[PDB]
Design a binder for these strands. Structure first.
Lengths: 557, 339, 362, 86
DNA sequence: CAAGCATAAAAGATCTAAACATAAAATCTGT
DNA sequence: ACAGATTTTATGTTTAGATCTTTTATGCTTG
């Protein structure tokens, strides 16, 4: 068989028996493979220890967030409500990702059953009810250690069956995705469970957008019923700015003065953070980790972060660093300007703590503050609150005075950071396709050895050459005229000469003598290229019964 | 007999027969009424179910001591007419007049409103030690009459909604009661006039956390939906007349992804490039779709990549408008042609 | 005025009655011959030069993978050969050496095949990784077992040591049967597992439209640009080119024709018998799919094959039919009464075309 | 033309609209009320109707009672009888 | 331009095959 | 070798996916 024609077929490669002691490392010797292996190993171990140090604090912050939100929602769930048992209390979690384990407190006289429902697991009202009753029965029987049909009467008979009171808490995982007709019908159905005087219900709506859509979609009577007890709770990772600050401070401490943050890098962090709110902290952690690993990867001097290896400077290191612009503008010379820790991080931490303890200001972005301090306009960020006017005297910061920060910094000047996490996907495709010269390297050393040393240079790759005309084409394109133009742009005699260049095959030379051999090989190339465009989505075809016209989908830029 | 042993109507016939035969020692004929209260309110309803219960009584023994009589209860008067030829005796219940519903609310709520703990707390706090149960009944009846006369045109004759409004508005009304007010019926109306004009039955006590790029994508999607494509180039030349039928009242039209991206680039302000479509734009668009804001034109198992799927905005004019002022981008400017 | 801007698009947004019949006639055999000649003779040396230049980036890719970053390759040209070369020859032996013996298994998943099914992919993943079974309570009320098993796998693997035990190559992640939301959700939940590595490739321009915020987070992609203008011989195999692929693009019958063209004379004969029996059943019962109600019984098929000296007994027939089943040219299920049924999931028109174009020539 | 009539707001006419469509005065665009049997009802229950997902404002309805009959029923003394015909 | 005329695609009726599910009789396994 | 463990025949119950059919949102098209 042909394995390429298969699907999802496992392959067990035969690893060579040849092996070494410590050649197996992703890090490669920099400076044209001149650095020693000990430097690479030290870089690897320092990267691992620093990554562990950062991620431990990140995990602590994340766990703190989860614990705090769970405790707050559990406290709001009971809140010592004195309201009469004639309505069910509702909690709208504003903009909450459906990833939380709402814990229900154990009560001696009341079961507390968390029933979780999702849009995929709720096609209609009857299945909502059957799933809810099955979860209720299973949880109650597991807690308590014949059968009952799955309907609302299980709630009616609960006091008789298990000799205990009930408290069911409905957690709708994605309340925006469920079609609100069935959700409204299910709420109205649950309303019928208030004639028992031994069952209390609690609804939790994991809303993502706002309450405007809930008001618009739900029936007025249902909104009136919900309004008797509702609690708008705003739970989100992006609200209050009190959690991104902790992670950024953790990163700042895990780099300490050992590393420096470039102004453009923090500007990019802020820009990419401003464009996403539903999932913000994870994106920030990804960006920081990628920048850190890239900096330890493509920078050779990261082995010299700690002072102990400063003496390990060699002739190649000094020769390379001699071209540092800071050195031109300005062993023992380097260390006396390296061990000087940057006071910017300590000053920023002190300022943040000072404003967050007694100045009664909390809604601020530590990333924004750090970026502003890096620029140097800290007054322009501290004057917005209009409350630290008498405290600005002691909050002044001495301007940036540092040297040799190019070698120890986190920045994106080669564009890898932006093109590896948030690349301009379509724009990159069009940039690569329009200017194919910079994608395919041009070589002339071995053009004599190759069989096509005269045709490769003159012409262009078929797909990009077709894309040139396609961009220069009109909105609606006749296939015939497009092929005519493509063939006219195609050199005539050179194609025939290339065909004649192979004497091994016989069918090719047999077809070569045919007068329209060029006119049909060009057509074959055109069908191949148009198929590739259709697969890539550049072009589309209208009604296939006509198939004489095509429409351009994507435009360059 | 295990109640879970019945799975078809025939099994119910057999189980009822088996239960009724074992009660044959009854002295006198006994009828047992089974009130299916809310039969039309079934969520798995179909036309061919009620007549099963209609003809059920034929399949049961004639001479049994216990006879089961059905008393259904439906609420549609178009489900009933489907079986109008069965000639089963029925008692139609007409709706309630405004005076009737006011009297019913008075009768069913004056006791509860009088016995409110909030009113007792207000009275003991404000020190009015000269009152009778007649005075409390009169003030409760006056509140009921005021709320009915103020919101009957809005709520119709539904007792439930009027009860909800009364429960909603009573705390503030009793909070606005002082010494000389209670002994003057017009004083409360002239002092608590705020309650009785504008209804309050919405969760907002009396927008989107989306990004800027997502908000602009939503605005561009709405513009694409509610603008004619042949006018797009003329209107957006940023570098016989318009129709006055106000297409914002009709269903949104279907556009293509390329047009959406082009107009999104056109309307996005220059920062620092024209904000070339990147991973972030497409991710935001997909997140908007999974929020059911930009609905496609095909059923489930959706593939966003096929050149046969079209997008249409799924928000009304209010949400998109207040999003536009949320980002301070004009929306009644490109629609100034259609006012 | 302009051509590459939104203003240019608006400007561009506002006839020859010659079809391809008058165009030079094309035969499939000579089409394949000429296309193959052009593919490995046009820009061979520049392509190898570019491949060697970008091969040096492999340690960076491995370092990105070993830190919980699922990796994606996007760009023009076919990345199938390049990505397979990266994963099979470089990634697996190197990670096997670094973990310490045997190489790490490499589940490569052809996404350009419209016959790729998520049930079979998860069957392979659970046959190889062998995760623990889910308890009865964890099954939930009729919930999808694949997604629940994957979430249980995530819970179990959140505590295991962070060493890769599988690499799941995903060729053409934005293909016809691999772009649907179900399999994408499966891959999204599967990629969170640190112990497996998700290297994928995309071709469509609007491919990132497939991933929401949650799916993008779970993928945790690190996009990498690979563009080598390869002609994609393998990708075009599964779909027709004479009709430009505008019709029956996701049918998958062209791949079946290609694989059946030169497979075995006896296999072709029995496939012809099965196809003919299915057409007879369709006629006994408008173009419809070949569902189970119209398929052929296993006992009936064995009797028919024995009458034609194709397969003597059950054992040989089942052994030679497992090959067709694994390549999705046919399916075997059990009816409600328990009778085995074998059927071809291709459309009646597609079945007739397959019979009259390759089967009928013997 | 003018005592003064309070033009009710959108959010206060929404409840009247829901009550009016609940009393079966309006119907959906092309909606079948009750299915013939249990299988068809089950099939419909599993399906998700398009009109459900359309926002509340833009759901297209149809009328039980034509305007001429509405004129025929409403008494002449009523204050809306002038607008009961085009 | 609209009407006419045509094909096209949305909305849903109608249905099936598959995944998920339970259960009673007869078979296959160890002491 | 006798009771438990597994299998074989025989349904019921939801989810995912299919094609037919009807209606109506698109284009084609003169002034």
């Amino acid at each position: 068989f042909a394995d390429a024609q298969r699907s999802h077929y496992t392959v067990y490669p035969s690893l060579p028996q040849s092996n070494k002691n410590d050649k197996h490392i992703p890090f490669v010797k920099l400076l044209s493979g001149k650095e020693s292996e000990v430097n690479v190993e030290k870089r690897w171990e320092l990267y691992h220890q620093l990554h562990s140090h950062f991620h431990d604090q990140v995990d602590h912050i994340i766990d703190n967030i989860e614990a705090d939100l769970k405790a707050e929602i559990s406290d709001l769930l009971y809140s010592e409500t004195t309201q009469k048992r004639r309505c069910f209390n509702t909690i709208f979690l504003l903009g909450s990702d459906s990833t939380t384990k709402i814990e229900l407190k154990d009560e001696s006289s009341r079961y507390n059953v968390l029933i979780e429902l999702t849009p995929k697991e709720s096609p209609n009202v009857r299945m909502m009810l059957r799933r809810s009753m099955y979860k209720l029965y299973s949880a109650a029987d597991a807690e308590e250690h014949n059968d009952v049909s799955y309907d609302l009467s299980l709630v009616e008979n609960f006091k008789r069956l298990f000799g205990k009171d009930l408290a069911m808490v409905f957690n709708f995982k994605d309340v925006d995705s469920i079609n609100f007709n069935t959700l409204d019908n299910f709420i109205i159905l649950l309303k019928s469970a208030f004639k028992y005087d031994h069952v209390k219900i609690s609804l939790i709506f994991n809303i993502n957008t706002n309450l405007s859509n809930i008001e618009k979609n739900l029936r007025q009577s249902t909104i009136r019923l919900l309004k008797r007890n509702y609690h708008k709770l705003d739970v989100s990772s992006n609200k209050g700015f009190k959690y991104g600050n902790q992670i950024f401070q953790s990163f700042l401490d895990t780099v300490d003065g050992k590393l420096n943050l470039s102004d453009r890098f923090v500007e990019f962090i802020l820009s990419k953070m401003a464009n996403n709110t539903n999932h913000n902290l994870q994106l920030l952690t990804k960006m920081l980790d990628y920048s850190l690993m890239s900096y330890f990867f493509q920078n050779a001097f990261s082995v010299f972060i700690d002072p102990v290896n400063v003496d390990f400077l060699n002739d190649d290191y000094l020769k390379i660093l001699s071209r540092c612009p800071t050195f031109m503008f300005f062993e023992e010379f380097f260390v006396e300007f390296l061990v000087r820790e940057n006071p910017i991080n300590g000053h920023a931490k002190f300022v943040a703590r000072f404003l967050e303890e007694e100045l009664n200001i909390t809604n601020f972005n530590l990333i924004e503050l750090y970026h502003n301090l890096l620029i140097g306009k800290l007054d322009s960020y501290l004057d917005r609150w209009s409350a630290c006017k008498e405290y600005k005297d002691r909050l002044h910061f001495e301007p940036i005075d540092t040297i040799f920060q190019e070698l120890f910094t986190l920045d994106n000047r080669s564009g890898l950071l932006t093109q590896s996490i948030f690349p301009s996907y379509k724009s990159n495709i069009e940039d690569n396709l329009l200017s194919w010269e910079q994608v395919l390297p041009s070589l002339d050393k071995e053009n004599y050895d190759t069989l096509s040393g005269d045709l490769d240079k003159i012409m262009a790759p078929v797909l990009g050459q077709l894309f040139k005309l396609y961009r220069e084409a009109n909105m609606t394109i006749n296939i015939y005229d497009f092929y005519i133009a493509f063939r006219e742009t195609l050199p005539k005699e050179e194609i025939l000469n290339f065909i004649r260049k192979d004497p091994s095959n016989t069918k090719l030379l047999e077809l070569a003598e045919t007068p329209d051999a060029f006119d049909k090989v060009a057509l074959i190339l055109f069908m191949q290229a148009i198929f590739a465009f259709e697969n890539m989505g550049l072009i589309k075809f209208q009604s296939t019964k006509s198939y004489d016209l095509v429409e351009k989908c994507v435009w360059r830029g | 007999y295990d109640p879970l042993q019945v799975e078809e109507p025939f099994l119910l016939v057999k189980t009822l027969h088996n239960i009724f035969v074992q009660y044959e020692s009854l002295q006198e004929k006994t009828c047992l009424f089974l009130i299916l209260d809310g039969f039309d309110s079934l969520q798995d309803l179909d036309a061919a179910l009620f007549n099963k219960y209609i003809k059920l009584n034929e399949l049961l023994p004639k001479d049994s001591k216990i006879n089961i009589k059905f008393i259904y209860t439906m609420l549609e008067t178009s489900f009933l007419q489907r079986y109008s030829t069965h000639c089963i005796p029925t008692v139609m219940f007409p709706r309630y007049n405004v005076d009737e519903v006011s009297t019913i609310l008075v009768m069913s709520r004056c006791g509860e409103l009088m016995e409110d703990s909030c009113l007792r707390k207000r009275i003991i706090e404000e020190q009015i030690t000269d009152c009778t149960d007649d005075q409390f009944q009169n003030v409760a009846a006056n509140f009921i009459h005021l709320i009915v006369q103020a919101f009957h045109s809005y709520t119709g004759n539904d007792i439930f909604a009027l009860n909800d409004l009364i429960d909603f508005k009573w705390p503030k009304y009793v909070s606005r009661i002082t010494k000389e007010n209670i002994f003057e019926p017009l004083a409360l109306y002239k002092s608590a006039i705020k309650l009785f004009l504008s209804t309050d039955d919405n969760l907002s006590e009396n927008t989107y956390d989306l990004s800027i790029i997502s908000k602009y994508l939503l605005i561009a999607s709405y513009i694409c939906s509610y603008l004619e494509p042949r006018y797009d180039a003329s209107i957006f030349s940023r570098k016989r007349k318009k129709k006055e039928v106000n297409p914002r009242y009709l269903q949104p039209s279907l556009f293509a992804i390329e047009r959406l991206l082009a107009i999104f680039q056109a309307i996005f302000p220059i920062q620092g490039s024209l904000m070339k479509a990147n991973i972030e734009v497409f991710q935001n668009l997909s997140e908007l779709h999974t929020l059911k804001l930009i609905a496609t034109t095909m059923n489930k198992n959706i593939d966003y990549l096929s050149p046969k799927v079209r997008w249409k905005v799924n928000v009304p004019w209010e949400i998109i408008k207040e999003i536009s002022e949320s980002v301070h981008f004009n929306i009644s400017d490109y629609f100034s042609d259609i006012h | 005025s302009f051509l590459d801007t939104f203003e240019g698009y608006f400007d561009q947004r506002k006839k020859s009655r010659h079809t391809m019949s008058m165009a030079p006639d094309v035969t499939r055999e000579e089409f394949s011959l000429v296309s193959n000649f052009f593919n490995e003779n046009f820009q061979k040396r520049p392509r190898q030069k570019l491949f060697e230049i970008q091969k040096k980036m492999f340690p960076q890719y491995w370092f990105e993978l070993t830190q919980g970053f699922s990796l994606l390759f996007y760009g023009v040209g076919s990345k199938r050969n390049f990505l397979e070369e990266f994963a099979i020859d470089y990634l697996s032996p190197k990670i096997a050496y670094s973990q310490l013996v045997n190489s790490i298994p490499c589940l490569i998943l052809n996404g350009y095949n419209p016959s790729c099914n998520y049930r079979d992919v998860f069957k392979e993943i659970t046959d190889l990784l062998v995760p623990a079974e889910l308890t009865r309570s964890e099954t939930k009320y009729w919930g999808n077992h694949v997604i629940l098993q994957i979430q249980k796998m995530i819970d179990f693997y959140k505590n295991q040591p962070l060493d890769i035990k599988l690499i799941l190559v995903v060729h053409n992640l934005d293909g016809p049967s691999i772009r649907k939301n179900t399999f994408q959700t499966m891959l999204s939940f599967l990629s969170v597992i640190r112990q497996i590595a998700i290297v994928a490739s995309t071709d469509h321009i609007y491919a990132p439209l497939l991933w929401d915020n949650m799916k993008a987070q779970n993928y945790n992609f690190v996009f990498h640009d690979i563009s080598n203008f390869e002609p994609s011989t393998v990708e075009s195999t599964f779909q027709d080119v004479m009709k430009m692929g505008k019709s029956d693009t996701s049918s998958g019958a062209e791949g079946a024709k290609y694989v059946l063209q030169s497979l075995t004379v006896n296999s072709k004969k029995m496939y012809k018998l099965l196809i003919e029996t299915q057409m007879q059943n369709m006629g006994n019962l408008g173009p419809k799919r070949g569902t189970q109600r119209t398929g052929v019984e296993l006992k009936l098929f064995n009797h028919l094959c024995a009458a034609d000296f194709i397969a003597s007994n059950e054992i040989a027939l089942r052994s030679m039919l497992r090959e067709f089943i694994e390549h999705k040219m046919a399916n075997i299920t059990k009816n409600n009464s328990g009778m085995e049924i074998i059927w071809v999931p291709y459309t009646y028109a597609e079945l007739e075309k397959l019979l009259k174009t390759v089967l009928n020539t013997l | 033309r003018i005592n003064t009539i309070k033009l009710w707001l959108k959010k206060d006419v929404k409840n009247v609209w829901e009550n009016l469509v609940q009393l079966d005065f309006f119907t959906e665009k092309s909606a079948v009320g009750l299915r013939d049997n249990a299988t068809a009802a089950f099939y419909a229950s599993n399906y998700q109707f398009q009109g459900t997902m359309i926002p509340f404002d833009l759901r297209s309805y149809q009328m039980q009672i034509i305007l001429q009959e509405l004129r025929r029923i409403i008494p002449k003394s009523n204050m809306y009888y002038s607008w009961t015909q085009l």
